[PDB]
Amino acid sequence: TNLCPFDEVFNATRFASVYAWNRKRISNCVADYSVLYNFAPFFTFKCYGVSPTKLNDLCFTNVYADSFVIRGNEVRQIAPGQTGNIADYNYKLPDDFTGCVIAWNSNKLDSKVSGNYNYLYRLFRKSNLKPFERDISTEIYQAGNKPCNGVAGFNCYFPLRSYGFRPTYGVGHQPYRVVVLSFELLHAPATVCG
Amino acid sequence: SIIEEQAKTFLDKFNQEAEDLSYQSALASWNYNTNITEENAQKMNEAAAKWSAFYEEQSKLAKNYSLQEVQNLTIKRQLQALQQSGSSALSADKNKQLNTILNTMSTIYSTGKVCNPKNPQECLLLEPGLDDIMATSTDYNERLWAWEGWRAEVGKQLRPLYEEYVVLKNEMARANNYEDYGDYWRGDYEAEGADGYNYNGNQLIEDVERTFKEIKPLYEQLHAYVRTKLMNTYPSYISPTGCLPAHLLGDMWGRFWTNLYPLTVPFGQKPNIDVTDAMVNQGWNAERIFKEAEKFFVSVGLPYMTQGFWENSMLTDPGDDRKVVCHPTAWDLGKGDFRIKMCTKVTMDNFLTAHHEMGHIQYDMAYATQPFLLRNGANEGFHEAVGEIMSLSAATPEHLKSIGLLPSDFQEDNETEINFLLKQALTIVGTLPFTYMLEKWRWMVFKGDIPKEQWMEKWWEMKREIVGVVEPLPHDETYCDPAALFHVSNDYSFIRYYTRTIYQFQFQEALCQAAKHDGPLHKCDISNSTEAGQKLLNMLRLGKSEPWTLALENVVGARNMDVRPLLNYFEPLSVWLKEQNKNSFVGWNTDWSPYA
Ligand SMILES: *[C@@H]1O[C@H](CO)[C@@H](O[C@@H]2O[C@H](CO)[C@@H](O)[C@H](O)[C@H]2NC(C)=O)[C@H](O)[C@H]1NC(C)=O
């Protein structure tokens, strides 16, 4: 018929970092939510606002897909009303969320001996995140009263740190690929159905 | 509260970069100890050097924060742990002098040899040698010459090195607000918190004395029984009233009395329980032992073992062109990686070492969620007590017959219980005075109460006043008997063994009472008991986050060390010994020596 590009989101060869997460829009695009199944290693598939079974009859205006890779013991922070390092400085969800999240293990594809330093995450920031926005800045974090002049030193830090994924790590430390889907209904006609 | 935020921000960075460095160092060290080769050693050295340099730089940088301005105790403990790095608070020349003194002293300890007075071309080492003579031989003169030799060709060489080493250690200690290299060691036993939970290093010297004073009478009964039993072997050298010669204790230093068992069996007509033929005839391998240990641990509510544990661990000798170090160790590489290295054979002792080296992984796994500088034990002698309560539980006839290694109609007699209790006593209660005396003497010599002139006259008189052991030959002021021991000549504290032997029985009594067990405490099994596991897990979740007083209260409901469980454990043995020691002298005098 027309199908809809979920194979370029879930089966992408390379994912993004947490602080630079990709965001994709779904056009006039008949989409089915059963191709997502049959992929057994879904360690997490739980939905908010909508029921997974009756997701093949509702129609929406557009759908947003956000993809990134985080640590295993950080998946629980991708949820409304959660506090933590990831959901204060990297990715924040609103309390009125009307979509759901998918997570699965990616040890074989993202962990290598001697470390995989290509994935980064924010560690220091002044304020919170104001749900659904990104920050890409390499400015030096200032903690003390003395001003920093673009050089790292005492009480002046670089705000980006790298993951060190290795295949020998424990279950809570392998990389996990996360895809978040969001459904909204605007004034325009609903153009995505099952 | 402006410094608290700065401390938190600094500690976050320190944690993130220490995790990676520590993991790399641990991985290199593990790879060396299974694949011994030169390049593995080179990689291990390069991995350790970077971590050491990073730690030193971080501690020097963290010195810039004041502990008085920090109100949260959780981060205050981390700051105290990080800034406490007063091993390099010395000039460079003094540090290199200390390092060379340590290296040469260890070299003399390892290389030293003794020679037979009647066979000059025969000379022996310590490990493949004299230890066998002192553990097996019976001849008086042979043990005498071995003892005197080792003393002569160890102390004569290690005396001036120790004399020059003490002052350097004191100078190092008097740079971290410590008055000697004593309380510096006693500082591990320090706590801070709410009212009634504090504990400093000056309270340890009083608790130890109270504990020993309570312990003494049982040791006197055991000493009298051993002395009256060790006279059919040497019926011309042991005095009925006097002390015991040092070269007849089944060990070179008298640290343990466990080799005197064949000469001191209460009932020698019936053997002890040994399930080794049964395991062979039933087809047991190395993996079955660890499966049984895991099942025992999960029966009380503790978690399973990780998937990586079964695939990354070396549970058997490789048996090929790959030389390994054969010594049981549990490892924490970090970041959820737990492994065990052990040579496993089908024997009871391996079956118990398995259950001891997994109670270390279950503690490590327990506190994996704490920050980096809080992931340890509580009081230096807490990690070896949680490992020796599991071996105690999984050695009971009831437990052995519940897994199919004893017949279902097996009946336990009363003589084997006495044999087991006496064998346990020869190892547990027979070493406490040794530890107490050695620590007391070394604390005094660091404090300055014993000058160099009275260096050896005080040692050999505390020997016959506390332990009850007399030297066979006179010793001048040139010998250094204490230096002829591994821990004294390698800078290892010798107080954890006393505290562990006190804590293990408190833990066992609390868990047994939680499991609703009736009968003697030495026949207690905590299997199939969720309450005991819940209590123990409540204790093992903290690490160094809270003062060890809270950790101890979380199990035993007591704030400090106690002796009653230990004395309760040896009650049938005590009554049997009192019945046996009915027409004999119990104590000893200090005015007899086998050379006057
Ligand atoms: C701990 O409990 C388990 C099960 O609750 C016991 O295992 C059973 O023990 C009975 C003996 O009364 C046997 O007849 C069963 O065949 C056993 N079942 C299994 C699956 O092993 C176990 O013996 C208990 N352990 C102790 C020390 O009491």
Ligand SMILES: *[C@@H]1O[C@H](CO)[C@@H](O)[C@H](O)[C@H]1NC(C)=O
């Ligand atoms: C031991 O090290 C050598 C070289 O260092 C290597 O070739 C060999 O594969 C290692 N052994 C194992 C079991 O990996």
Ligand SMILES: *[C@@H]1O[C@H](CO)[C@@H](O)[C@H](O)[C@H]1NC(C)=O
């Ligand atoms: C500690 O002293 C001051 C601040 O107290 C600081 O400038 C200095 O760099 C610190 N020392 C080191 C060795 O970093």
Ligand SMILES: [Zn+2]
């Ligand atoms: Zn141990």
